[PDB]
């Protein structure tokens, strides 16, 4: 009832892990190096906007 | 003094192998840490733990 209601197995609001989980290994000034997770999250984000603009 | 024993003395072809101690010896007392895990890095070269 308090800690794991079955409805929470289904995701509606996705937590975004902060940079220390997905460190941007930023070498030089004119370059960066985003973590795999940072790309996959941008993929989630991209797919989501696609859906939200499509349904609206 | 003569050793009581007689030794099996003679030439034998020995090879010098590629692992020299001074290329292996490693010590660390605080040094570089990984970005993600914030734990010591790996390897003699990288000043690892």
A25 → chain B, closest CA residue: B35
Run of H or E residues at A39: helix A36-55
Quick check: A8 and A15 in contact, CB under 8 A? no
- In this structure, what are the phi and psi dihedrals at residue B33, rounded to the nearest 5 degrees? -120, 150
Please give the Cα distance from B37 to A21 (Å, whole number): 9
Please give the Cα distance from A55 to A25 (Å, whole number): 37
Query: Which residues of B are less than 8 Å from A25 in CB distance?
Result: 35
How many CB atoms within 10 Å of residue A22?
17
Calculate how close chain A gets to B12, using CA atoms only, in Å. Answer: 55
Give me the total of CB pairs closer than 8 Å, taking one residue from chain A and one from chain B. Answer: 4
Query: Which residues of B are less than 8 Å from A23 in CB distance?
Result: 35-36
Quick check: B22 and B13 in contact, CB under 8 A? no
Query: Which residues of A are less than 8 Å from B36 in CB distance?
Result: 20, 23
Method used to determine the 3D structure: X-ray
Resolution limit in angstroms?
A: 3.5
Quick check: A2 and A21 in contact, CB under 8 A? no
Quick check: B40 and B49 in contact, CB under 8 A? yes
């Amino acid at each position: 009832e308090v800690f794991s209601r079955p409805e929470w197995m289904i995701l509606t609001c996705l937590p975004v892990p902060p940079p220390p989980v997905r460190p941007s290994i930023s070498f030089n000034e004119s370059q960066r190096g985003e973590d795999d997770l940072t790309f996959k999250l941008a993929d989630i984000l991209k797919a989501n906007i696609s859906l939200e603009t499509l349904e609206h | 003094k003569k050793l009581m024993a007689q030794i099996f003395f003679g030439p034998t072809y020995y090879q010098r192998l590629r692992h020299m101690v001074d290329d292996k010896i490693h010590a660390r007392a605080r040094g570089p840490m990984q970005v993600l895990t914030r734990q010591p890095v790996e390897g003699r070269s990288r000043d690892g733990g």
